[PDB]
Design a protein around this ligand. Structure first.
Ligand SMILES: *[C@@H]1O[C@H](CO)[C@@H](O[C@@H]2O[C@H](CO)[C@@H](O[C@@H]3O[C@H](CO[C@H]4O[C@H](CO)[C@@H](O)[C@H](O[C@H]5O[C@H](CO)[C@@H](O)[C@H](O)[C@@H]5O[C@H]5O[C@H](CO)[C@@H](O)[C@H](O)[C@@H]5O)[C@@H]4O)[C@@H](O)[C@H](O[C@H]4O[C@H](CO)[C@@H](O)[C@H](O)[C@@H]4O[C@H]4O[C@H](CO)[C@@H](O)[C@H](O)[C@@H]4O)[C@@H]3O)[C@H](O)[C@H]2NC(C)=O)[C@H](O)[C@H]1NC(C)=O
Ligand SMILES: N#Cc1cc(-c2cc(OC3CC3)ccc2F)c(OCc2n[nH]c3cnccc23)cc1Cl
Ligand SMILES: [Ca+2]
Ligand SMILES: [Ca+2]
Ligand code: NA
Ligand code: NA
Ligand SMILES: [Zn+2]
Length: 805
């Protein structure tokens, strides 16, 4: 209940929220149906519009007007944004030449440059170039400030997940806003765009910027604007707040535009009807900048122009229906559209089986436009699993398509021509970033980066300590003139052992065999030196990775590769090797096909054994350093060491063998050598973080050999590919993957064909950042390069996407 007969007199857009049943004049009052009786009259004035005209110049103040053209308006902070242009012969901000802002030029009493976040819903990245002729204000921001060619949103590429990611630096799985619609089974409650339940604070995890600010003594303007408040009024409210006295004035502000998303849904991303919404957004930017200029803040405020996601062409006719696949279609609930999420209609139905639903949705039609996944099998780059609000069954929908339960759901709801929500690496979902101000760089282009990184930077811009988040603080230092955060490398927690030869052959009883009994002082000293690390500079180019948790491991040196061998997991945590452009691929000789060799540096008790694999009818093995890339017949024996073996399902060995036999050499040819680091990952609870021993759910039968959930590789070369990988003087280039270790290739519908038609496609889908691997392994890479640490942090957040331009 609201006693709406209090008044908003002198309280319009009050920052502090007053408590029911006392009536509200703050922004959200509309959304709670709680504004005071006179809120529209006092706070939403529209009289005479939003622009001064010559005849109004120096008028007598009339408090009914939406904005003012009277001599006292500047000191009141409530002039129309074009007041100085119309009435004082000033230029619009957009018509002024741009001039470097070397230092903040702020009015007295400003403690720090304010930050304004100008967020635009549905603003696809390519609009910056394709719409540049109709967006002069935005184009000046872009060209004069710091910009990326695009910014990667998070998955799903929907509004609230992305704007709340911007606010918190967290993946949706951690912040809790995992789509625009959700069911939380602990709460037994549903979150929707419509209605009121979405304002309940239990939906919203982490700590958004406005709370981070407030807790640290920095005042914040509103981040949420009610849909009925027009854009001109949002801008005027921000400008008025900026005119407050020093002790009352916020330091961080947000503007939000529902456009171009609103029109994009109706008309498609490049519909002719899209030109107007872009013109209008640009006009709004013009109003803000003119307003800032009038208040002498245009060379003081840092402005971020940022989108939440892009927009793709999507129509009703490109809809797949689950009713064409499942018989039981009324036993399920689908969250539909540009992604699919499936759960049981009733928890009382114990005849509901996820395995049979997945199988009925897998590779059933030749051009099928969605792919089902148990959430733990989604590409790890999506970070979309560790939340009870994300249903176990997920459908990744192809760009340009929808999924629905039944046809009736589409015509009892063609209207729309645009949508978004798809995989966050899809080009059409990419959105925009521009930063303009004293703290940003001048006329600077930066590479594309992920929106999870911005929270840290916004905290840096405001002198705030960020709450714990998924950004990598320092990775965006290259955007900034000053206020950089100077991170240090994490300390190594576990130092390795360096074992020598400590065991005789006959101490091992592993059930392994190798045809290797084949016998020189020239080559005897030479092989001793390889085992003490004489080739390690060739194979370990960026130093050894640091182990950031407590464990027991050994460094093992060899002619062609170096490894960090875990005594706890009985396999390497990592294996490092360099393949030059010139290297030759060879086969596994006939006599070595089943060869596994005890490693006399490592006890039997901390070794794998061949008998376990013999007895485990589902599990085979592979090697981390590939025998195919041995430098010589003699060196090839090292590749068959039991310490280089890892457990692999035969179906996965098809993938791994093609990667090692064909792809590594291809990449060395294309990139002028590559350094490769490969290893296992264990993420049985799908939290994106390294498992401890006691979290492992599967072992090679009858043994303590833990089975990885995934295998990674990090492939590094010289960005200047005219230099070979192993003699690179400058910046590096990386691509990585985290392949799911699956007992079938059901994910790849064309897997009956030759690996050349499907393996690389799988690997592209599971592309990853080095940082993703770091989380999953507790390893810290690139510890010894000639590069700055901030540059290395940037490299570690790079994602190789495999989209064209
Ligand atoms: C991305 O960045 C984020 C942020 O840094 C990373 O997330 C952190 O990961 C940590 C490890 O997974 C995690 O630490 C745990 O926190 C527990 C306390 O948590 C509460 O308080 C914090 C701080 O204010 C708060 O942020 C949390 O908020 C979560 O939950 C509410 C809903 O209840 C949501 O509003 C919110 O969205 C958020 O949900 C997300 O996180 C939780 C896990 O915390 C998930 O379950 C959800 O799915 C969702 O993703 C909390 O309200 C603390 O109690 C834990 O301690 C246990 O583990 C330690 C290990 O040191 C052990 O020693 C203890 O014994 C203890 O175990 C006991 O409880 C067990 C479980 O009940 C039980 O089995 C044992 O037997 C014991 O009794 C732990 O320290 C941290 O909370 C989150 N933070 C956030 C914001 O998510 C994330 O990892 C990064 N991602 C990547 C890929 O790097
Ligand atoms: N950084 C950031 C940032 C966060 C938000 C946001 C606000 C929120 O407010 C609580 C009361 C729900 C919650 C989550 C958010 F992510 C945001 O919201 C703009 C918005 N105003 N009006 C809309 C209508 N629909 C969708 C979004 C908005 C804009 C930005 Cl720049
Ligand atoms: Ca949106
Ligand atoms: Ca884990
Ligand atoms: Na086997
Ligand atoms: Na298949
Ligand atoms: Zn939309």
């Amino acid at each position: 209940w609201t006693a709406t007969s209090g008044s908003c007199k002198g309280r319009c857009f009050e920052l502090q929220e007053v408590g029911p049943p006392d009536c509200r004049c703050d922004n959200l009052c509309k959304s709670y149906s709680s504004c005071c009786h006179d809120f529209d009259e006092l706070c939403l004035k529209t009289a005479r519009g939003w622009e001064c005209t010559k005849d109004r110049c120096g008028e007598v103040r009339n408090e009914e007007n939406a904005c003012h053209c009277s001599e006292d308006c500047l000191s009141r902070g409530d002039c129309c944004t074009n007041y100085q242009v119309v009435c004082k012969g000033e230029s619009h901000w957009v018509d002024d030449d741009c001039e470097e802002i070397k230092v903040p030029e702020c009015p007295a009493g400003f403690v720090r440059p304010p930050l304004i976040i100008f967020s635009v819903d549905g603003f696809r990245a390519s609009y910056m170039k394709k719409g540049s002729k109709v967006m002069p204000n935005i184009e000046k921001l872009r060209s004069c400030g710091t910009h990326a060619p695009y910014m990667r949103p998070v998955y799903p590429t929907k509004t609230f997940p992305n704007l709340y990611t911007l606010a918190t630096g967290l993946y949706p799985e951690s912040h809790g806003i995992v789509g625009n619609s959700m069911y939380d089974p602990v709460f037994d409650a549903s979150f929707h765009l419509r209605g009121r339940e979405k304002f309940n604070h239990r939906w919203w995890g982490g700590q958004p910027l406005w709370i981070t600010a407030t807790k640290q003594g920095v005042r914040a303007g509103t981040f949420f604007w009610s849909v009925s408040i027009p854009h001109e009024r949002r801008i005027l409210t921000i400008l008025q707040w900026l005119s407050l006295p020093d002790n009352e004035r916020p330091s961080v502000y947000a503007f939000y535009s529902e456009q171009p998303d609103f029109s994009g849904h109706k008309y498609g991303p490049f519909g002719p009807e899209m030109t107007n919404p872009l013109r209008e957004i640009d006009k709004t930017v013009g109003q803000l900048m003119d307003g800032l200029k009038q208040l002498r803040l245009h060379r003081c405020v840092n402005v971020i122009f940022v989108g939440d996601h892009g927009m793709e062409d999507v129509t009703c006719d490109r809809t797949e229906f689950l009713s064409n696949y499942l018989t039981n279609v009324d036993d399920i609930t689908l969250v539909p559209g540009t992604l699919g999420r499936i759960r049981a209609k009733s928890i009382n139905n114990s005849k509901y089986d996820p395995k049979t639903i997945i199988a009925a949705l897998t590779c059933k039609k030749p051009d099928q436009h969605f792919k089902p996944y148990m959430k733990q099998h989604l590409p790890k780059r999506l970070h979309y699993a560790n939340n009870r609000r994300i249903e176990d069954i997920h459908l990744l929908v192809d760009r340009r398509w929808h999924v629905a339960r039944k046809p009736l759901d589409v015509y009892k709801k063609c209207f729309f021509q645009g949508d978004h929500g798809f995989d966050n690496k899809v080009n059409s979902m990419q959105t925009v970033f521009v930063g303009y101000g004293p703290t940003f760089k001048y006329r600077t282009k930066v590479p594309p980066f992920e929106n999870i990184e911005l929270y840290n930077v916004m905290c840096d811009l405001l002198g705030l300590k960020p709450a714990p988040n998924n950004g990598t603080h320092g990775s965006l230092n290259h955007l900034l003139r000053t206020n950089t955060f100077r991170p240090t490398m994490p300390d190594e927690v576990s130092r390795p052992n360096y074992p020598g030869i400590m065991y005789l052959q006959s101490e091992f009883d592993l059930g392994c065999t190798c045809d290797d009994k084949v016998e020189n002082k020239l080559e005897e000293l030479n092989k001793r030196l390889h085992t003490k690390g004489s080739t390690k500079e060739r194979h370990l180019l960026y130093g050894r990775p640091a182990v950031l948790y407590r464990t027991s491991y050994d460094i093992l040196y060899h002619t062609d590769f170096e490894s960090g061998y875990s005594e706890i997991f009985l396999m390497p945590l990592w294996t490092s090797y360099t393949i030059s452009k010139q290297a030759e691929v060879s086969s596994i000789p006939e006599h070595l096909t089943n060869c596994v060799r005890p490693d006399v540096r490592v006890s039997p008790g901390f070794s794998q054994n061949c008998l376990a694999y013999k007895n485990d009818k589902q599990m085979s093995y592979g090697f981390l350093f590939p025998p195919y890339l041995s430098s010589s017949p003699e060196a090839k024996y090292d590749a068959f060491l039991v310490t280089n073996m890892v457990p692999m399902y035969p179906a996965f060995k098809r993938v791994w063998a093609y990667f090692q036999r064909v792809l590594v050499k291809k990449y060395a040819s294309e990139r002028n050598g590559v350094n490769v680091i490969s290893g296992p990952i264990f993420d049985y609870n799908y939290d994106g973080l390294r498992d401890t021993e006691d979290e492992i759910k599967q072992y090679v039968e009858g043994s303590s050999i833990p089975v990885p959930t995934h295998y990674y590789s990090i492939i590094t070369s010289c960005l200047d590919f005219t230099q070979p990988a192993d003699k690179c003087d400058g910046p590096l280039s990386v691509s990585s993957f985290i392949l799911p270790h699956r007992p079938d290739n059901d994910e790849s519908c064309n897997s009956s064909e030759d690996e050349s038609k499907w393996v690389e496609e799988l690997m592209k889908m599971h592309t990853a950042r080095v940082r993703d691997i770091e989380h999953l392994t507790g390893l810290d890479f690139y510890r010894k390069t000639s590069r700055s640490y901030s540059e290395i942090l940037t490299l570690k957040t790079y994602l190789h996407t495999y989209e064209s331009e």
